[PDB]
Design a protein around this ligand. Structure first.
Ligand SMILES: NCCCNCCCCCS
Ligand SMILES: [K+]
Ligand SMILES: [K+]
Ligand SMILES: [Zn+2]
Length: 616
């Protein structure tokens, strides 16, 4: 398997700039590139990434997405003086040309293809290209919006031609609409293009009717173009995560892409003079993390916009942090999306429902610790320590006589639970861990009770099994997610899902649609996973997507030793790549059960809302 993350960058792409007065392009400056690199250098992130060199893009690659006449016209700009460059840039909308811009354009394009080759050749797990000029606005025969050539369009066509890829996902989280990318794959069902963008009912640049949710692609492309227009400024983290949980992620895991490419513009972050949104830079660590279980982790992030220097570098670092697998920051203050965001989300799901049936509605440096059974020895990755002090032993005896006739190996089960939790919360040495347990009722109790006194303000508990558990969920510092078989629901602090071939596709619709939005709003300090001894084709995706909560501090208790189950949970806990999936659409009885639970919880947990609220 691949390892590492590529950082493709080169100082040469900062050696072109605007040469005349133009309020439309003043914000696009070479310092966007140098600030982003020094921010990665300061935080020690560039030093941890494999620096792949930048190459030029051959004209045969440039013609994959551009016309000969437009290439021939751009090819002539290096010979123009500034007066001739003014005239040539007036032919296009909101773009300037420099003597060196054709050179850097071929470098930005080449840098993307370099990143594609590195990721597809398994030389790296993922990567980011810090490039200039941007791409997503440029079209087959025109420059547009600071873009000369469509770098991300090249990546997808290049990876189609040179690797026989049939399913590519392009996620454009820049605040502007990537109309060049939409045009280029409009009638193409092999490249799924998702884009949210500041729209304001067409009043915001580039003022295109086809930027609206109505455009779902033409011909057989239909359903493989997803526009999510923001019609008000000031969108927050909850708006962004709602758009992911209820639009992009359901479609993405169903598409099952073989490669994920990101038009990463950070003009969608707080402080940016162009987007005027209010998402904090930490949101991009989660946007990145939620997409890594796709395409076995093969993700190529390409830079687009982002024009506030004092804030651009922070969002770049958060993205690379997640690319390298570092723990994701806790997001606090999440709730329902605002009404306009709920409007667009509700609209885009309706138009797309005729292509993605899950949108239908009824009419109205040690990272992991493994503690296997005694005598068991397994082969663990380089970041798993494989596991008891006397201070811990007195505690197990202290709890022994007060709460538990307990004469048993089991006393070693609880002694490990206490010290793996000690090393996760206090010492900050380990990040997460997994422990195979004998008896649940006692192990669940000691794990949860010792966690609340670590201290853990709030504990999310995910339990896969039937029957009740010794967990009191009244105080509100504990939320319980139980996946069982028998129909069990009461208070608004428990989520029970009583689920055939059906299941794996239903569990995914529930994980992204119900489990993740509640967990993200709950903001736990620790996730506690439990699996009964009594078929988790999805548990790797579950344990990976849930690591966005609680800074990645999760403790799994597996009842009964299963060789390949424990092998999988450790692999996802330690940060390895996750294998994809196919599956059969969920049964109607399960979709009904799922939304009957959204009705019951979305009043308290507003992040579950994917429609505008029914005002009394
Ligand atoms: N005030 C000038 C607005 C021109 N819009 C250019 C598009 C920039 C997006 C690059 S991603
Ligand atoms: K966008
Ligand atoms: K498409
Ligand atoms: Zn932009």
């Amino acid at each position: 398997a691949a390892s590492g993350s590529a950082l493709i960058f080169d100082e040469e792409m900062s050696r072109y700039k605007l040469l005349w007065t133009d309020p439309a392009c003043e914000i696009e400056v070479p310092e966007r590139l140098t600030v982003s690199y020094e921010a990665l250098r300061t935080h020690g992130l560039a030093q941890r990434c494999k620096a792949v060199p930048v190459r030029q893009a051959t004209e045969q690659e440039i013609l994959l997405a551009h016309s000969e006449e437009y290439l021939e016209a751009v090819k002539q700009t290096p010979g123009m003086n500034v007066e001739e460059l003014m005239a040539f840039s007036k032919k296009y909308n909101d773009v300037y040309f420099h003597q060196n811009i054709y050179h850097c354009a071929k470098l930005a394009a080449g840098a993307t293809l370099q990143l594609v080759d590195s990721v597809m050749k398994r030389e790296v797990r993922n990567g980011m290209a810090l490039v200039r000029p941007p791409g997503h606005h440029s079209q087959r025969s025109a420059a547009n919006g600071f873009c000369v050539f469509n770098n991300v369009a090249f990546a997808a066509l290049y990876a189609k031609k040179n690797y026989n890829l049939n399913r590519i996902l392009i996620v454009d989280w820049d605040v502007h609409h990537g109309q060049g990318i939409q045009y280029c794959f409009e009638e193409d069902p092999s490249v799924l293009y998702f884009s949210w963008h500041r729209y304001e009912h067409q009043s915001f640049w580039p003022n295109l009717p086809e930027s609206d949710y109505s455009s779902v692609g033409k011909g057989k492309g239909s359903g493989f173009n997803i526009n999510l227009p923001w019609n008000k400024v000031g969108m927050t983290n909850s708006d962004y995560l709602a758009a992911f949980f209820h639009v992009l992620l359901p479609v993405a895991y169903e598409f099952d892409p073989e490669l994920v490419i990101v038009s990463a513009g950070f003009d969608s972050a707080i402080g940016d003079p162009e987007g005027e949104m209010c998402a904090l830079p930490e949101i991009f660590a989660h946007l990145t993390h939620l997409l890594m279980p796709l395409a076995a982790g093969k993700m190529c992030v390409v830079l687009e916009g982002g024009f506030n220097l004092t804030s651009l570098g922070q969002s770049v670092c958060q993205t690379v942090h997640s690319l390298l697998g570092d723990p994701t920051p806790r997001i606090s203050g999440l709730g329902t999306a605002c009404d306009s965001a709920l409007e667009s989300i509700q609209n885009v799901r309706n138009v797309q429902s005729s292509y993605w049936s899950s949108f239908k509605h009824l009419a109205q440096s040690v990272r992991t610790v493994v503690v296997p059974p005694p005598g068991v020895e397994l082969t663990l990755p380089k970041n798993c320590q494989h596991s008891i002090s006397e201070s811990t032993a007195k505690e197990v005896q202290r709890i022994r006589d007060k709460h538990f006739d307990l004469t048993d190996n089991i006393l070693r089960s609880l002694g490990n639970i206490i010290s793996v939790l000690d090393r996760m919360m206090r010492s900050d040495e380990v990040c997460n861990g997994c422990v195979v347990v004998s008896d649940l009722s006692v192990s669940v109790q000691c794990a949860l009770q010792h966690a609340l006194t670590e201290p853990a303000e709030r504990v999310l508990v995910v339990y896969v099994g039937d029957g009740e558990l010794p967990v009191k969920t009244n105080d509100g510092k504990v939320f319980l997610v139980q996946i069982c078989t028998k129909e069990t629901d009461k208070c608004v602090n428990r989520l029970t899902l009583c689920l055939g071939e059906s299941l794996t596709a239903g569990f995914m619709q529930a994980l992204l649609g119900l489990i993740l939005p509640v967990a993200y709003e709950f903001n736990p300090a620790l996730v506690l996973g439990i699996v009964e001894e009594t078929l988790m084709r999805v548990w790797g995706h579950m344990t990976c997507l849930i690591q966005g909560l609680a800074r990645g501090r999760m403790l799994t208790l597996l009842q009964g030793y299963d060789k390949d189950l424990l092998e999988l949970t450790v692999s996802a806990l330690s940060g390895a790549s996750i294998s994809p999936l196919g599956l059969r659409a969920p049964k109607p009885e399960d979709v009904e059960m799922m939304e009957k639970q959204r009705q019951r919880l979305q009043e308290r947990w507003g992040l579950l809302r994917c429609t505008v609220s029914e005002s009394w």
